[PDB]
N, CA, C and O atoms as a DFTB+ gen file, in Angstrom:
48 C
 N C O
     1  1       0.858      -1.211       0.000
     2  2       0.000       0.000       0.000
     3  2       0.880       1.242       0.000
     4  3       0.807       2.204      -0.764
     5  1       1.702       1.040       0.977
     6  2       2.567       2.428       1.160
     7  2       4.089       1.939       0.596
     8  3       4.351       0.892       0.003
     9  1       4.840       2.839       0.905
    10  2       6.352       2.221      -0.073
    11  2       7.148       1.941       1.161
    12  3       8.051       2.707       1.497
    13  1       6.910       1.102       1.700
    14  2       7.876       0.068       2.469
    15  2       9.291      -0.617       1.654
    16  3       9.710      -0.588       0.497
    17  1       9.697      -1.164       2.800
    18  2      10.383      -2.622       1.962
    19  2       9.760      -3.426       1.854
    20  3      10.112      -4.505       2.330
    21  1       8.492      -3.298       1.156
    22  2       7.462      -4.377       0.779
    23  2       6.097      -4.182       1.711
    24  3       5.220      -3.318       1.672
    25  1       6.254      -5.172       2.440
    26  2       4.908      -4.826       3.948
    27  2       4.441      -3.720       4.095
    28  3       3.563      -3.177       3.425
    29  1       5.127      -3.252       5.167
    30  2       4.480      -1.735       5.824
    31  2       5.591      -0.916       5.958
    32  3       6.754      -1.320       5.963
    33  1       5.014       0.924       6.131
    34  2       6.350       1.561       6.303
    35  2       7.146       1.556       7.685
    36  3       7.838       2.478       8.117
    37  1       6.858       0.103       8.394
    38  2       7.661       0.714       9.791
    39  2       9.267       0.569       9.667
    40  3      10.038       0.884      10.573
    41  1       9.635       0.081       8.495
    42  2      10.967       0.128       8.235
    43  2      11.261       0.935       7.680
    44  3      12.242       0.662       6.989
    45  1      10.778       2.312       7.534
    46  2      10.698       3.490       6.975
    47  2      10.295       4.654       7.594
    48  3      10.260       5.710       6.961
């Protein structure tokens, strides 16, 4: 959905 490293942005 959002631009993660794939998944979600909490690595972002």
């Amino acid at each position: 959905h959002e631009v993660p490293s794939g998944p979600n942005p909490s690595s972002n």
